Design a protein around this ligand. Structure first.
Ligand code: MG
Ligand code: MG
Ligand code: MG
Ligand code: MG
Ligand code: MG
Ligand code: MG
Ligand code: MG
Ligand code: MG
Ligand code: MG
Ligand code: MG
Ligand code: MG
Ligand code: MG
Ligand code: MG
Ligand code: MG
Ligand code: MG
Ligand code: MG
Ligand code: MG
Ligand code: MG
Ligand code: MG
Ligand code: MG
Ligand code: MG
Ligand code: MG
Ligand code: MG
Ligand code: MG
Ligand code: MG
Ligand code: MG
Ligand code: MG
Ligand code: MG
Ligand code: MG
Ligand code: MG
Ligand code: MG
Ligand code: MG
Ligand code: MG
Ligand code: MG
Ligand code: MG
Ligand code: MG
Ligand code: MG
Ligand code: MG
Ligand code: MG
Ligand code: MG
Ligand code: MG
Ligand code: MG
Ligand code: MG
Ligand code: MG
Ligand code: MG
Ligand code: MG
Ligand code: MG
Ligand code: MG
Ligand code: MG
Ligand code: MG
Ligand code: MG
Ligand code: MG
Lengths: 113, 195
RNA sequence: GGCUACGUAGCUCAGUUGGUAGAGCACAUCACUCAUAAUGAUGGGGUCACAGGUUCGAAUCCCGUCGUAGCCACCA
RNA sequence: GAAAGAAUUAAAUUAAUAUAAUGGUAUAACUGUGCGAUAAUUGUAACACAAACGAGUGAAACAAGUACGUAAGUAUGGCAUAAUGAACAAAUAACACUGAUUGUAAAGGUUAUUGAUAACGAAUAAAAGUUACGCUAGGGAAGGGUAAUAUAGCGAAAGAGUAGAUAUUGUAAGCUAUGUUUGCCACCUUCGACUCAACAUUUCCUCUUGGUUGUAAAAGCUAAGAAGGGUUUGACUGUUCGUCAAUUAAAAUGUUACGUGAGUUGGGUUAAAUACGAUGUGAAUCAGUAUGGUUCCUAUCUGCUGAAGGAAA
RNA sequence: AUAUAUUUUAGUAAUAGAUAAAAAUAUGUACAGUAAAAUUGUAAGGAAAACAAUAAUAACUUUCUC
RNA sequence: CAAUCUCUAAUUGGUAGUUUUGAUGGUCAUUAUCAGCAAAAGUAUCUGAAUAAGUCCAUAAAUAAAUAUAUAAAAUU
RNA sequence: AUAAUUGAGGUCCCGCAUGAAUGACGUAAUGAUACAACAACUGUCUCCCCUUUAAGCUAAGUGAAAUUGAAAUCGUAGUGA
RNA sequence: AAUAUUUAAAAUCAAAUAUAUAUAUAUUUGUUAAUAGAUAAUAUACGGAUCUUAAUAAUAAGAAUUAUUUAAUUCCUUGGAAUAUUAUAUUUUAAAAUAUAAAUACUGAAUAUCUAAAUAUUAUUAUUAUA
RNA sequence: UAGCCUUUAUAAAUAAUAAUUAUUAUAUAAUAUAUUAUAUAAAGAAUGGUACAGCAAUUAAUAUAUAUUAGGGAACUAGUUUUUUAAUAAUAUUAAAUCUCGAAAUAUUUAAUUAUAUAUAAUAAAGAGUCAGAUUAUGUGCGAUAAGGUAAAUAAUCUAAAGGGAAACAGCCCAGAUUAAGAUAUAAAGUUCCUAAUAAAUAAUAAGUGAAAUAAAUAUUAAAAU
């Protein structure tokens, strides 16, 4: 006899973060083999086509008319925003830094070049 | 010619599966298409082997060949390759070797069809009864006026079921993808896509 | 991974301590004969194993890899 | 009205992708071309995915430097998912950290790199068999289920039957029953002979009966009822079986722990002895052959065969 | 026309285009483009060598012109 | 010479201590892809694989390409 | 050879898988060896019967054993580790 | 009557529900039975008895099987109303009239409630003497 | 070792569990062809590719007095027709573990809201046991659409669960024993007797069919409808 008793395990390749879900920077929204979902707004894409969040926000799945026949995952900076954002409106940006109210810290920062 | 022995280039073993109980009301291959009289399954969905089908065909032929311009349309092909282990062997230790070809036959499906120039219906009926004596199901004579079997105890006329243009229906109640495409086609996106 | 010493002709084998293409060997034609064949004579093919230097001058020395294997190392 | 350009629409990812298969890829991830050959770079890497640990995967950002690009920017190897191996012990460098009295040293550490443990989380640098002379600890880590097969039946009837499928026969395929065979499952850890048999009926004989151009008669053949009675003795073999001989009305087929070893036997199967053929380097071994060869039991209960006592008559 | 001198040419070698599915540098970056099959043909050429051809121009810009 | 002591080497079932994986009648043990897998993920068996893997690909197509020819300058001549 | 022989002896040689001191082959004698045949004999058997003594049984005396969860311990069918 | 199919509510018709509503639209429901085939070994084996109805004749039985149902029957919107039934009482001549009731089928667990008791926790009290 | 269990605690604590809202369309009304409110309909934010459904592309199967490409015959004087042989096309019809162009429900799953707080999650410090499982139902692999078989997936029970029902019964149908009590509601299952509890209605059966473990093709006899 000779049996075909050999197989790899399942690659855990679902969506790891869902519509309306809060995200943090670095977090993986999708694991996939090839771009089933394309990286949308405020979202990066890795070597393994893994969509990850570039900013803190709300994960949103959407279609964009500019790219028909392509699904997108992006991260809205608030829950208020429809994440296929209006084209000619200005981009919702995050400053994401804090001023150094502390005097010593500010001085150190000024010194550093 | 090849209905009882398919010529798949890459011959391969197959899982057992199940005979499809067509819960949605299929009526596909459950209608007289080629001939005047036919033989349909009447019982629960069943597997018919290649050999059995061949024997049924042969039985039918005895009546068909004497006819002027006599014809037999074999409606189903034995597409599923069945392997078997021996009764001699123990359980486990791989899968058995190829044995025969077989077809999964839903409840309502037509198996055969005939039409001669000088074919009286009684003779055809007799032939089909004799064909049925060799097959594992319980079978039924079907004429062009006789209506389509769906369930075990249920019936249907295809003439009744409605005609629909599905593009129009889609337009009426559109999917998200379709809407996105339509938007893309519009000028405020098509001009500024910048490819 | 390092270190060897060998691989001329279709076969067998010289040659080797430098100034070389040589031998009989099985193979195809003539030859003496009543007719074979033993024996006598026709010729046969070598990049002197892939491939570079030193002496006008190395098949032979110094070798770049190729091969047969053999050896050491590492072997936790 | 014409020419040229910009192109758009439709189709396509069936080609091509270093390589399997899958997903993705023309907005190309595919292909061509310039430069280049750098990012197949150096320190910190949060946060996620995955996840027992060991590991694995994606990766924002900060800092040093590099390449291309007018710029925006892009590059921490390859469209993605394989391409792998722990410690210990050695080895090579760099580091300037320790330097066993002090100074050097040795030796150890840090950082980088090296070769394999494929039984692939790797027990050792290094290990095969045999026992029917065996031993200890434990585990069970014919009956039951099934009915493929087997046996029997049914439906339909190709076809034999001098003619007519259905007197008799009945391909291959169809639908069942049985638990009598050979299997499968793993809940459950002795063949034959003698003796005595009980039960079944799917009846071999005997009784009744239907059919039989194939019942003239007589012998038969086939089918229905029928289990009352009956159903073998020898040669060969351990055999059941089988071959034959002589009989018989007939020499039916099963079930009963393939009835019956606390009833007998022990020829077969079987351990120790031994030999032969084959297998093995060998000890020894064998879906082999042969000679020899170990269990016993006063009956408590049930049950059955007989026999008493007591009793409510 | 011929002699010498001093030079120059002749080492004769493919790409001529940001080349684009013959083969060749498989990682970076920048710019650009589209394959395949099938069909109709064509010197040897034949089922099978190579080359050609094979979806639609509404609107827009520029140019010439009635 | 040989014998004995000490060191060193060859040989050894003569003799002693050990061992003889897990799964199977030589084949499977690690990794990847699809199905099985039942529209998230996961999912087994001596399940089916035209299964595939223990890799492959790099230091290279160079040099030259602005002040030049006789003479004189050096506000580019 | 037997009424009838998977046994025995003789002979043949596709010796699955004989063979010469793991000796080869054929004899005389020997053997509580193994197998087969003939004779004679018989209770081995057809087919058992009768008899004898020691037990068995009863009475007297002495007085075991293995075993034993507890037992007020029937048949059949069904069920059920 | 005869021949030949089908055994069906898809269509069709009928009936019911829901939206505008004497109609339309949408939905839901309604389409055979018996026998034979039939079958092994301790003993009939629905768990057993037994169950299939019958006038004369009962103050009285009449599936204890299969299928669709109800809780006396019929309309109206679980509820009321009417109808006869059954039982009883009263009055009149064994009958008639009047009225009261029964209509909530029942059995059924160590389920739940009630009824009491115990412990533990949460939240309120009372009495007695980290109060 | 993780999973599941236990003990003791911790909070700028509800982060847990369940459902709703979220969408699309219609009608009506009010503002500026758009927005809000109200009502109704629609398996109703996001993710998906199984059933079903389908034959598109892939892989397979069938048919054409149809067309083309050649071949084998065949009749008249190389040309031509017919009866065709395969392939390709066209048209019609079909199916698949590794086909899905359509496509559910269950599912995964997010925010806020409401409801569960005599309740959950999370974290901290500590103790375990377990790693032989079984059956039933559904969807599969293996087996023969065999097994009280084997292998896993989901749920339940048994395991460790007594009580009622299923004749008897680990796994089925109900239901979870703190101790009693026994009036009232009951569950599953029952109500001629054994045995706690019953009366009716309309049909059908006559075979003891059947009456708590439904046996098939087929045959005969009826019965309806056309
Ligand atoms: Mg997988
Ligand atoms: Mg289908
Ligand atoms: Mg692909
Ligand atoms: Mg997780
Ligand atoms: Mg970790
Ligand atoms: Mg690549
Ligand atoms: Mg690349
Ligand atoms: Mg080690
Ligand atoms: Mg020192
Ligand atoms: Mg191991
Ligand atoms: Mg291991
Ligand atoms: Mg070992
Ligand atoms: Mg022995
Ligand atoms: Mg059995
Ligand atoms: Mg005939
Ligand atoms: Mg047959
Ligand atoms: Mg009988
Ligand atoms: Mg007679
Ligand atoms: Mg009698
Ligand atoms: Mg026996
Ligand atoms: Mg006994
Ligand atoms: Mg031997
Ligand atoms: Mg003896
Ligand atoms: Mg030893
Ligand atoms: Mg898939
Ligand atoms: Mg899967
Ligand atoms: Mg999944
Ligand atoms: Mg003989
Ligand atoms: Mg004898
Ligand atoms: Mg032999
Ligand atoms: Mg010898
Ligand atoms: Mg010898
Ligand atoms: Mg002696
Ligand atoms: Mg008693
Ligand atoms: Mg309807
Ligand atoms: Mg019986
Ligand atoms: Mg009962
Ligand atoms: Mg209680
Ligand atoms: Mg633990
Ligand atoms: Mg909440
Ligand atoms: Mg699938
Ligand atoms: Mg799809
Ligand atoms: Mg799912
Ligand atoms: Mg286990
Ligand atoms: Mg255990
Ligand atoms: Mg089991
Ligand atoms: Mg236990
Ligand atoms: Mg529990
Ligand atoms: Mg219980
Ligand atoms: Mg309780
Ligand atoms: Mg009965
Ligand atoms: Mg029964």
């Amino acid at each position: 006899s000779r049996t075909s008793m050999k197989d790899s395990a399942g690659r855990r390749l679902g969506p790891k973060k869902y519509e309306g879900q809060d995200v943090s920077t670095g977090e993986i929204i999708m694991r996939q083999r090839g771009t089933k979902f394309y990286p949308g707004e405020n979202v990066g894409i890795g070597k393994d086509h893994s969509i990850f969040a570039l900013e803190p926000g709300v994960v949103r799945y959407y279609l964009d008319p500019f790219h028909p026949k392509r699904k997108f995952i992006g991260v809205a900076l608030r829950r208020d925003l429809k994440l296929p954002s209006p084209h000619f409106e200005p981009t919702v940006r995050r400053f994401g830094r804090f001023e150094l109210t502390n005097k010593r810290a500010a001085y150190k920062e000024e010194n550093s070049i | 010619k090849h209905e009882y022995a398919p010529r798949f280039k890459i011959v391969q073993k197959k899982q057992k599966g199940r005979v499809p109980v067509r819960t949605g009301g299929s009526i596909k291959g459950s209608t007289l298409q080629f001939g005047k009289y036919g033989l349909r399954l009447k019982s629960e969905g069943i597997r018919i082997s290649a050999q059995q089908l061949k024997e049924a065909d042969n039985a039918i032929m005895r009546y068909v060949r004497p006819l002027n311009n006599g014809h037999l349309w074999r409606r189903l092909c034995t597409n599923v390759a069945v392997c078997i282990k021996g009764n001699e062997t123990r359980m486990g230790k791989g899968k058995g070797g190829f044995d025969h070809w077989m077809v999964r036959v839903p409840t309502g499906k037509i198996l055969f069809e005939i039409n001669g120039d000088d074919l009286h219906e009684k003779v055809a009926r007799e032939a089909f009864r004799k064909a049925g004596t060799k097959l594992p199901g319980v079978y039924e004579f079907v004429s062009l006026d006789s209506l389509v079997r769906v369930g075990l105890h249920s019936f249907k006329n295809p003439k009744d079921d409605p005609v629909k243009n599905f593009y129009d229906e889609n337009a009426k109640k559109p999917s998200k993808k379709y809407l996105n495409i339509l938007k893309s086609q519009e000028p405020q996106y098509k001009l500024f896509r910048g490819r």
